[PDB]
Amino acid sequence: DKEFQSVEEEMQSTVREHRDGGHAGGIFNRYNILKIQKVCNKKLWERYTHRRKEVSEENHNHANERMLFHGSPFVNAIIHKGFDERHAYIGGMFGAGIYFAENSSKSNQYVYGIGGGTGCPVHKDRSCYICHRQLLFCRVTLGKSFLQFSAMKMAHSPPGHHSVTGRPSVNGLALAEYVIYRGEQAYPEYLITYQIMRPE
Ligand SMILES: O=c1[nH]c2sccc2c2ccccc12
Ligand SMILES: [Zn+2]
């Protein structure tokens, strides 16, 4: 399948060297991709496309949709119930939103919790090469995205906007991040099962 080879290529090509030296997500240059499953949840898809149409109408007939990664210990709940701002990451740089990355390795830092938590449930290892991890590769409606470089604790999108884009800056972010404040603005399209690989 070419659709899944495209997803594997985005997963592999967006890995970056992290400033924390692998503390949160583990030490690796690449992944062993085990499975890529397309999520087909009609009710969530309709909730997503309904909101996408509304955002497009409010953003010069443009949804500003992007495919982005999301890491969480709650990926199974997300696939069944959808993203939910009532469970937003309050401690985030941009406040109470749902965070996405264009770099798979940034999302990998969140798979076992904030700052990687205590790592895998079996070995309590943030750099476990044994346990299988899951990431989501999502359709995200950004609409009119508010560009921000420094911490700005929001409860909702800035007035007239549909999302926040965190841009890299000297004093701030190493890599971009994208924040929505309404769960219906993302669809968990692909579930990726993988392992991080021990460097060569
Ligand atoms: O993929 C992400 N998952 C989660 S879960 C709590 C925070 C984040 C997060 C933060 C910045 C960029 C990506 C992510
Ligand atoms: Zn493990």
Three-class SS of residue 146? Answer: strand
1-200 under CATH 3.40.50.11540, yes or no: no
**How deeply is 169 buried, as exposed, middle or buried, from its count of CB atoms within 10 A (0-12, 13-18, 19+)?**
exposed
For the chain, the domains span 1-200
- C-alpha closest to that of 188 among 116, 129, 107, 96: 107
Ligand closest to CA 89: 1
Rounded to whole angstroms, the Cα distance separating 60 from 143 reads: 9
Ligand 1 neighbourhood includes 185 CB (under 6 angstroms): no
Resolution (A): 1.7
User: What does residue 133 show for φ and ψ, rounded to 5 degrees?
Assistant: -105, 160
Rounded to whole angstroms, the Cα distance separating 62 from 55 reads: 8
Q: Which residues are annotated as a binding site for Zn(2+)?
A: 120, 123, 128, 131
